[PDB]
Ligand binder design. Structure first.
Ligand code: NAG
Ligand code: NAG
Lengths: 49, 66
């Protein structure tokens, strides 16, 4: 649900789109995420790993 | 996450692409207010195949009818 559940009723939203919201909040447009989604997933998985 | 019209992806400038099952719409983050997907509220980037979740649609611009 992203950050919506911290502001009211929890609103479902796909996770691949949620990161596009969060990139949009640091000056990086959505185009970076979707066209590099596979790479970013591997980096995040390894970091958690 | 996107719209492909002429072999090019299309991303929402400020909003998300929302469909009620038949027609697609772009609307604000926190208030449902659909608008027709034109070229001014969407910026093009990509090759229509790199993005996962592509859906075909029309993003027709106002410069063509006039
Ligand atoms: C469920 C559904 O189809 N909703 C609307 C429909 O009522 C409308 O006629 C159309 C545009 O004409 O856009 C869509
Ligand atoms: C969009 O149209 C192209 C050309 O007809 C087609 O190859 C492609 O499969 C379509 N997209 C989807 C999701 O079906």
């Amino acid at each position: 649900s992203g950050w919506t559940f911290g502001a009211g009723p929890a609103l479902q939203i796909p996770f691949p789109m949620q990161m596009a919201y969060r990139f949009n909040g640091i000056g990086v447009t959505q185009n970076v995420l979707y066209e590099n989604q596979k790479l970013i997933a591997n980096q995040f998985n390894s970091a958690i790993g | 996450p996107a719209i492909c019209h002429d072999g090019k992806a299309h991303f929402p400038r400020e909003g998300v692409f929302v469909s009620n099952g038949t027609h697609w719409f772009v609307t604000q983050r926190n208030f449902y207010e659909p608008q027709i997907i034109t070229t001014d509220n969407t910026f093009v980037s990509g090759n229509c195949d790199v993005v996962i979740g592509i859906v075909n649609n029309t993003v027709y611009d106002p410069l063509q009818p006039e």
